Amino acid sequence: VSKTHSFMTVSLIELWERFGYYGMQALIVYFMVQRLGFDDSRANLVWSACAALIYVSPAIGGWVGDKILGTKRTMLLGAGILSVGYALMTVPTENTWFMFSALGVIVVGNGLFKPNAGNLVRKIYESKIDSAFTIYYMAVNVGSTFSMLLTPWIKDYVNAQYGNEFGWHAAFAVCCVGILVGLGNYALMHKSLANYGSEPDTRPVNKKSLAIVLALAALSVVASAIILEYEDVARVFVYAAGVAVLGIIAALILTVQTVFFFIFYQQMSTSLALFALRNVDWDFQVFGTHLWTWSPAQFQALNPIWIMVLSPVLAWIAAKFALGFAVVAIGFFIYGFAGQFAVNGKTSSWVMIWGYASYSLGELLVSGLGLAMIARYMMGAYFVASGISQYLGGVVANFASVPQDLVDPLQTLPVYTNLFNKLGVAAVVCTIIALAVLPLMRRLT
C-alpha cells in the first residue's frame, strides 16, 4: 500500500500498547504501597526487578519473532498476552501471588511485543528509518501522556463512587481496554498496512513451535512471579546477570553511561513518585489562581508532556551525553531545593514541573544517543546492563525510603531531598565522566 501507511499502523498499535503500559506504571508502586500493604523499600525493589525483567525480556522475544514465529505473529501474540496480563490485574483480589502472576504475564507479553513492533518500523523503511523512529518515539509519548493522565483519575473517581476495590482494578481495566483498542486497530489495518515485514511470517505458523513457545512462555510467567516475589531471588538473578554481562571497545563507556542514566531514570517511577505523594502540594496554581489539583501519580505525565513540548524546540558529539547529565543534575537540584523554598511540610508543585522539565530535557538529549549510536558501531549485553541498572535504580531510590509509621511530612521532606541532592551531585560526576572520555572518541576516528 504505502510506507507511511504501514508505519502508521505499527506506530498506532505502539501508541495504544504504551498507553496500557504507562497507565499501569503510573499506578503500580502506589498500588503496592497504598492498596496492597507494601513498604516502599519492597515496593521499589519489586517494581525495579519487574522493570529489569521487562527490559531484558525483549532480547529473547525479538529472536522469537524473527527466527521462530512471525514478527507480525509474535507482535500480535505479545499484544494478546499483554491484554491477559492487565485482565488479571483487574480481578479484585489482594492476593500478592495473583498480582505477581499478572505482572509475569506482562513481562512475557512485553518481551514478545516490543522488539517486533520495533522491527516492523525498520522493515517499513528499508535513513528515513530515523524519520520513522523519531515519530514513533513521539507516538509513544502522546499515548503515555493520555494514560498517565487518565488512569490515576479513574482510580480516584471509582475509589470514590465505590469502595477501595476496584478503584485500582478499574484503572488496570482501563489499561486492558487500551491494549484491546490497539489490537482492534491493527486488526482493522492488518495485511492492509503491514503487508510485507517479518522473516518467518511468509508461511503458516508452526504449531510445534507455537506449542513450545506458549509452554516456555507459561514457564517464564512463573519464573517472573517468583523473581518478583522473593527479593533474594531477584537480587541473586540480577547479580548473576551482572557478573555474566560483565564477563562477555568504544561502545563500552557508552553502555556504562547508559547504566548511570538509567538509575536517574528509574528514580521517577519510584522515589519521585513517593515524594510526590507525600511531600508535594497537589494543588497546581498558575500564579495566581487555582486550576487544577494533581493526583500524585499524574505528576509522571509531566515527562512525556515536556518531551513533547521541547522536542519541537530542540529540532531547531557524545557531548550531548554530557549536557544530558548536566541537565538531569539541575533537575534533581530543583527537587533538592524543594525544601529551601515552597514548603509547609508538604509543599512545592512547581518544583515538580521545573524538576521534570529539566530532567526530561536531559532525557530527550540522551533518548537518541543509545540504540542508533551502538547499532551504527551486543543487543543482549545492552539489554542486560539496562535491566540491571533499572534494578540498581530501585536500590538507589531506596536511599530515600520512609518507614511506614513515619507520616509527618515535615520529617519525610528531608529524606527525599537528601537523596535528590545526592543524585544531583552524582549526575555532575557523570557529566565529568562524559566530557573526560570525549577525546577517547577522537583517538579512534
Ligand SMILES: CCCCCCCCCCCCO[C@@H]1O[C@H](CO)[C@@H](O[C@H]2O[C@H](CO)[C@@H](O)[C@H](O)[C@H]2O)[C@H](O)[C@H]1O
Ligand atoms: C492523547 C493525549 C491526551 C492528553 C490529555 C488527557 C486528558 C486527561 C484525562 C483525565 C484528566 C483528569 O485529571 C485530573 O484529575 C484530577 C485529580 O483526580 C481531577 O481533579 C478534580 O477532582 C478533584 C476532586 O474532586 C477536584 O479537587 C479538582 O478541582 C478537580 O479538577 C481533575 O478533574 C482532572 O483534571
